[PDB]
Design a protein around this ligand. Structure first.
Ligand SMILES: Nc1ncnc2c1ncn2[C@@H]1O[C@H](COP(=O)(O)OP(=O)(O)NP(=O)(O)O)[C@@H](O)[C@H]1O
Ligand SMILES: [Mg+2]
Lengths: 194, 582, 451, 455
């Protein structure tokens, strides 16, 4: 998850932060109080070298570096279709609404998909069925054209213990699976590194 | 009172500890021999010093004394007609004091003669409120240049006491009632070479300089108070161009700064200039010489002492031309220090602030209103040489200069090899003063000069267009109109553009003479053009105009006293060609 | 008032035992004689900051000087009272008029516009220059640069565009924001006298940066000017035209600061981040949905050694919507303005032309003039290679057309303001040299209406 | 007492670092005593705190750091000078090479020399008749000039150099030339060529030779021309001789500077050459000329081979920006059988005006010289077209200009290495070529002159 460090140097696009040992290479991070986007290129002991991709003007030492916990990823789920995004999957439509502004304000963080919305999830798989990555456990009619099939995400092997049709958000548990690591909960969305 | 200790010596770069009392840019006496240096960096108590003299024989543990003052020049009578080194040490006096034909070290020498008697004529009345730039009086430094004594920047007050008399540059000649208390003035003021001397107002240079060089005055003129560059490969003629302007231009005063160049070139000027006239030429001339094998850092010093000396005479209300020859050596001196300091270079190894340095220099040049109630006008025209490696002008020094000057006289090695001089590339060169100058020339000559010049360049540009296609198939198949065009372009190139500096007559051309030559050339193209349109043939016209075309070709050689011998060619053109059609 | 100056290296200065300092934050040096010099933070570290002084560093005694951290960057005090006034690139006045009563102070970086918030350029802008108006139309909210060279008259062209720029049948008037970046006194005075002489100043705001001004100020200038423009456009609802020369001087300053921080250059000696830097500037232009006003940019740059491959023109060309190119070939034959139509391009011309905006015949004639000029130049070559005789009578006409097109159409003079209607009429006049049989890219519908 | 320290810290390439020293000066001469007793000279490049960085001329081959010592001799490298040097052969560091005696220096001089006060200089204007038309007429050499030869490997620069030393003389005087020869990194066969010619002509008995050969240490070459110019400046300004200095090959000199430059890991310039290459070169080439009131002179004829035949290469470029012209040899002219293969178009002399004319050569020198260049440049362009497009693709008169360029090359420039032409023979031949052309073409010559001289 999220990892906080401290900026020790600011030099143009280059920022250096210490106390980043929980961070990894190629991780995305939010730089400074403000929180502009950066990526960890290098790591020395606990000192990370960070390329900052927005204006670093007005950032100084002592301010945090918040690590996302992962490298650039996309949210994959109902709510993806028909949306317009930027390159790092910032939702342009939502920017306008939540922000009430005409600008992609720097330091502004918004999830790519609507995590508040209700979806009818039609379960098509049966309890006690063995499953692995790629199997369709149900679907959602996401748009007037496309049917969004809900697949068992990569890294999950097991048996379906509980599943029901009904109305869920993309953050709700919609299925329970018996893995080798005990029981696991699935939702309608998965994350993948680009 | 504080004495530094050298900790490091490496070429012209010396470092001394225990310097905390000193300031950035202070001059220093360095080592046991007390060589002249400058502090350029301070890290805690450690000064990085660049030495304006040789450092062989110096080492750690020797003392450093900071003078507490920045590289300055002494400005006063006794300045004109002298050759100085980069840090303004008089070279004639150096030879006699040191008793040598060679250059020594650590020897302190006042810029001017402080024992000389000058007659100071006071022209102000007691009880006049004065400030910076006001002329309290003057000394006749030379038969032609009157040296005006001006209130130094900083001094405001009321002339208490003044009178005429014989004085040295040390004697007090005026006393001023100031708010801080009485101050007395001599005929000499000190100025830091790296500060631009202040002015009331900067103006637009609208009056063309006369160089007497046909290609410049016609196609790429420089005005008085303008800035021009001559970038060229070695042997192309940058130096000779600058000698011509020093010799023939109608400025009041010439400051020639030899920056990192040949010793002989400087001895040529001191020796040849007193024998010339414009009243001797040397009497309006100042020379700073820092040759190629003299200390590197002194190259920068020379550029700065020259422009400062130029500004000083500008304030007096004079027109000053400053030649820097060449600015590449100055930049290359900056490249040497940068490398020695282990700075991160800009392009081609030069320091990144190269552009900003150049812009400071040129922005100091220009036509102005000088300080003082008189509101005098004075100009500084900068003529700079640039020496790009391999003649390639993508390099930084040329590129950065082109952004701050308004005239470019690009020399071509290919034109020099065929001995076409000055070897200015008429296609590549430009003058931003061209349009304003055309107007001034039209008014003066009372002819359509602007139009002649446009047609001249238009023809040269067509020649270029043609020669591209020609060099692969042309001539045999060319239209008569175009054959004619190549001949007018050839007449321009050979009869007008080509001019030899060393010929007794061709060394200089008056405007009255330039106009007459160009008219005669264009009249040929015009009259021949009209004949072709009547049905005549190229071959007919050329064969029938051999004698007249010889006259046009030799008109560069006609004496200024005999201009009718040129303007009369125009009648012969018209008669000769009118005859051939029938 | 930290009295802790550890190093001076040229115009760079090391300041120790400081805390809470930000990158690009402004500083003040109180020297031992009491002299004040301003600076900016170029690098900041746990224990030290690197600062650059604007007036340079000469005469400073380290241990007896003190530094104050102002607590903010460069900011522009916006007001509607800046119209008809002249500033330097830092926004201080240079005109000797009254002081500015600032509504507020704004940061000068600006913000990225959410793409779905942008409006398509709708309006035609009458520059009054046929070569632009007809063949390379400029439209409200476009970014259309001028690519020039040393010794080429972009000075005159920029002044002309600034005098003549207008929208048609709008009574609404153009605010013109003019930025000079590292230009000579002589160039800057020409622009100031031109604006005063023609009264163009009454609509304008000028930010005048000189070549001997510090590099940091020179980098500030475009950002000062665009912040002011966005204020007038998106706060005051004005329609703003921003003219910036010379953009090559700005890239030059970027290098200077880049080296100060010991950063290795990217392509051709320029910072890796040049594209982000230039993009950031130029994209601050356009229309926004639901907002009355607009910003239109015309950046002017000189291509070193006439090289369109050069990073500055090359990277600029990707960012901006076309380019107008001046050439010395044209200039030396006296063509004024020396615009070469063939390599010039406007990427949004169609949105600004035709029925209702200019005239119905605009596009068709542009396409035809463009071809006939291409054909004319080819015919000219043929003349040289194969000789007078191999030329078709139809070919001789194209030759004469290309000659008249450069000499009469393109060569309007730096003080001639042509309406779109005169331009269109002159084109037709020029097209009339050819046989109807040759004007293949115009509907007969239009041939019969305009000759 | 001399300072010796047994604290060598670092031996890397040609560079040595000594630590725990005091009293050391920049440029001070040093001797390394090796563990076996061998002695090697050097120079202090850099001195800081208690450390010095030195360059060893003789290389650092076979040193044991712990057991070697460094002597710091209390002065810069000097030449022990004497008029007795005349007739002797020395190595690159000024030490006898020929089994002969002595010498007891009259004095020691620091080899860097001193800059000639520009007020103290005489401007050089005495014409030297080399006997080679391509020089005396079109690229005139004057006593006190630096006029290099730009060449290329496989080309006869040494043949030309010897010819010039052999025939050079001022007119209306019986003055001769003392020759200082500096060999810099050249081969035995090349150095033996000059030796053989100097013995044959007897010029050996008025020559001083400083010999660094291809088998000698490279770093030594940085010292070599400076030894030679110190010898020459001493002979001229202190013993009043007219001195001819021939140094070859300067390209080897600049290669050595790069080696040190690279070893020091200085900021490199173009191609790895140091930023101070121009400056370094000028401290050699500006040691030439004449001084007011002193009867001697130094005339320098440096030789270099242009790498890749490329004149834009830093060595020829910078060299060209320093010296007073250059005589260029081209592979094209050489293969065509032209001797010497001087290409007059890119060649130059900057001191030809005040040294030629009425009372020096003849009143038609400069006019014909200029005229010939005009006709040659044009004729050469016409000749080459004719090779490509056939003679038929040429004009009536350009056909004449082309024949002119053939006669000019084959007759005028091609005289042979054993041919000594008086200036009067050269100027007269020039006219015979110019007479090939119609009077109208000769725009560079005034009517006054044509009437008088043109047949
Ligand atoms: N205008 C001219 N008239 C006659 N001869 C000229 C002219 N210009 C150049 N030359 C000849 O060319 C030589 C070289 O000119 P010079 O001004 O010394 O070149 P440069 O460009 O200054 N070389 P460098 O100083 O190495 O960059 C001169 O000695 C003349 O012989
Ligand atoms: Mg020169």
């Amino acid at each position: 998850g999220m990892q906080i460090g401290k900026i020790i140097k600011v030099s143009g696009p280059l920022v250096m932060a210490e106390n980043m040992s929980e961070a990894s290479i190629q991780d995305m991070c939010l730089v400074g109080d403000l929180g502009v986007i950066g990526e960890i290129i290098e790591m020395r002991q606990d000192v990370a070298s960070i390329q900052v991709y927005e204006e670093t003007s007005g950032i100084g030492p002592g301010e945090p570096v918040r690590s996302t916990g992962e490298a650039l990823s996309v949210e994959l789920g109902p709510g993806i279709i028909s949306q317009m995004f930027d390159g790092i999957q910032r939702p342009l439509d939502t920017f306008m609404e939540v922000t009430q502004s005409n600008f992609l304000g720097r330091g502004v963080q918004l999830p790519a998909l609507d995590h508040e919305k209700q979806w009818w999830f039609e379960a098509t798989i049966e309890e006690g069925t063995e499953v692995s990555a790629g199997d369709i456990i149900g679907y959602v009619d996401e748009t007037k054209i496309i049917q969004h099939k809900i697949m068992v995400p990569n890294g999950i092997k097991g048996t379906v213990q509980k599943i029901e049709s009904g109305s869920f958000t993309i953050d709700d548990p919609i299925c329970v699976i018996e893995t080798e690591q005990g029981l696991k909960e699935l939702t309608m969305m998965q994350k993948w590194p680009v | 009172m504080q004495i530094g200790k050298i900790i490091k010596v490496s070429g012209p770069l010396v470092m001394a500890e225990n310097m905390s009392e000193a300031s950035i840019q202070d001059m220093c006496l360095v080592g046991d021999l007390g060589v002249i240096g400058e502090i350029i960096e301070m890290r805690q108590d450690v000064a990085s010093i660049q030495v304006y003299e040789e450092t062989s024989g110096i080492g750690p543990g020797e003392p450093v004394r900071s003078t507490g003052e920045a590289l300055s020049v002494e400005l006063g009578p006794g300045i004109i007609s002298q050759m100085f080194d980069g840090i303004q040490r008089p070279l004639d006096t150096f030879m006699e004091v040191t008793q040598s034909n060679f250059l020594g070290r650590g020897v302190q020498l006042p810029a001017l003669d402080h024992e000389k008697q000058w007659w100071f004529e006071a022209t102000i009345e007691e009880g006049t409120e004065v400030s910076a730039g006001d002329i309290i009086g003057y000394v006749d430094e030379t038969k032609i240049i009157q040296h005006k004594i001006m209130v130094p920047n900083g001094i405001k007050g009321t002339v208490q006491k003044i009178e005429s008399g014989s004085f040295t540059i040390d004697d007090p000649i005026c006393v001023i009632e100031t708010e801080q208390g009485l101050k007395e003035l001599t005929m000499m003021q000190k100025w830091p070479v790296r500060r631009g001397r202040p002015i009331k107002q900067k103006l637009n240079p609208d009056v063309p300089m006369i160089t007497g060089q046909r290609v410049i005055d016609t196609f790429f003129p420089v005005t008085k108070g303008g800035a021009a560059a001559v970038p060229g490969p070695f042997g192309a003629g940058k130096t000779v161009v600058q000698h011509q302007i020093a010799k023939w231009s109608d400025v009041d005063l010439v400051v020639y700064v030899g920056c990192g160049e040949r010793g002989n070139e400087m001895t040529d000027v001191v020796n040849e200039f007193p024998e010339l006239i414009d009243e001797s030429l040397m009497e309006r001339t100042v020379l700073i010489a820092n040759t190629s094998n003299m200390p590197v850092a002194a190259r920068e010093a020379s550029i700065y002492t020259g422009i400062t000396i130029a500004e000083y005479f500008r304030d007096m209300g004079y027109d000053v031309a400053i030649m820097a020859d060449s600015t590449s050596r100055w930049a290359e001196a900056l490249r040497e220090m940068s490398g020695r300091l282990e700075e991160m270079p800009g392009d081609e190894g030069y320091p990144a602030y190269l552009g900003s340095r150049l812009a400071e220099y040129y922005e100091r040049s220009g036509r102005v209103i000088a300080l003082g109630s008189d509101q005098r006008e004075g100009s500084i025209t900068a003529i700079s040489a640039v020496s790009p490696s391999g003649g390639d002008i993508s390099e930084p020094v040329t590129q950065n200069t082109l952004r701050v000057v308004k005239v470019f006289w690009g020399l071509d090695s290919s034109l020099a090899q065929k001995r076409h001089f000055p070897s200015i590339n008429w296609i590549q060169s430009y003058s931003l003063y061209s349009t304003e100058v055309g107007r001034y020339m039209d008014q003066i000559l009372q002819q359509d000069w602007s139009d002649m010049v446009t047609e001249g360049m238009r023809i040269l540009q067509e020649e270029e267009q043609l020669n591209e296609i020609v060099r692969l198939v042309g001539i045999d198949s060319l239209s008569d109109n175009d054959r004619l065009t190549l001949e007018v372009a050839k007449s321009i190139r050979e009869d007008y553009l080509q001019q030899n500096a060393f010929d007794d007559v061709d060394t200089f051309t008056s405007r009255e003479k330039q106009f007459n030559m160009l008219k005669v050339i264009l009249t040929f193209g015009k009259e021949a053009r009209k004949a072709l349109s009547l049905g005549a043939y190229f071959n007919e016209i050329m064969e029938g105009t051999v004698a007249v075309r010889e006259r046009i070709s030799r008109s560069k050689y006609i004496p200024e006293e005999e201009l009718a011998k040129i303007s009369s060619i125009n009648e012969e053109i018209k008669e000769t060609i009118q005859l051939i059609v029938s | 008032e930290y009295r802790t100056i550890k190093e001076v290296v040229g115009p760079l200065m090391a300041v120790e035992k400081v805390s809470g300092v930000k990158y690009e934050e402004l500083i003040e040096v109180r020297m031992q004689n009491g002299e004040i010099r301003r600076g900016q933070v170029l690098e900041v570290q746990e224990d030290k900051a690197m600062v650059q002084i604007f007036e340079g560093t000469s005469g400073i005694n380290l241990k007896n000087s003190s530094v104050r951290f102002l607590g903010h960057p460069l900011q522009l005090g916006v007001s509607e009272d800046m119209i008809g006034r002249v500033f330097d690139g830092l926004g201080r006045p240079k005109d000797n008029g009254p002081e500015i009563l600032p509504e507020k102070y704004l940061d000068i970086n600006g913000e990225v516009i959410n793409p779905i918030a942008r409006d398509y350029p709708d309006e035609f802008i009458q520059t009054g220059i046929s070569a632009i108006d007809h063949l390379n139309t400029l439209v409200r909210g476009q970014k259309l640069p001028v690519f020039s060279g040393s010794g080429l008259p972009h000075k005159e062209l920029a002044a002309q565009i600034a005098r003549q720029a207008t929208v048609l049948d709008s009574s609404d008037d153009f605010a013109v924001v003019f930025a000079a970046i590292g230009i000579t006194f002589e160039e800057a005075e020409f622009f100031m006298e031109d604006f005063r002489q023609t009264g163009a100043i009454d609509r304008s705001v000028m930010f005048m940066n000189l070549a001997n001004d510090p590099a940091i100020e020179r980098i500030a200038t475009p950002r000062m000017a665009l912040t002011a423009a966005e204020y007038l456009a998106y706060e005051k609802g004005m329609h703003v035209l921003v003219i910036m020369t010379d953009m090559t001087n700005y890239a030059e300053a970027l290098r200077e600061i880049s080296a100060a921080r010991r950063e290795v250059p990217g392509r051709r000696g320029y910072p890796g981040y040049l594209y982000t830097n230039l993009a950031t500037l130029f994209e601050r232009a356009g229309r926004i949905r639901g907002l009355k006003g607009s910003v239109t940019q015309i950046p002017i740059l000189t291509m070193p050694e006439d090289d369109k491959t050069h990073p500055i023109p090359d990277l600029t060309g990707y960012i901006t919507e076309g380019q107008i190119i001046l050439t010395r070939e044209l200039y030396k034959s006296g063509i004024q303005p020396p615009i070469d139509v063939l390599p010039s391009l406007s990427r949004l011309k169609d949105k600004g032309t035709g029925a209702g905006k200019t005239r119905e015949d605009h596009a068709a004639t542009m396409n035809q003039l463009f071809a006939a000029y291409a054909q004319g130049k080819q015919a000219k070559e043929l003349a040289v290679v194969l000789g007078e005789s191999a030329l078709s009578d139809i070919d001789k006409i194209y030759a004469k057309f290309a000659e008249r097109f450069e000499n009469e159409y393109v060569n309007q003079g730096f003080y001639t303001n042509r309406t779109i209607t005169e331009t269109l009429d002159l084109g037709w006049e020029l097209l009339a040299m050819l046989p109807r049989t040759e004007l293949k890219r115009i509907k007969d519908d239009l041939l019969d209406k305009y000759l």
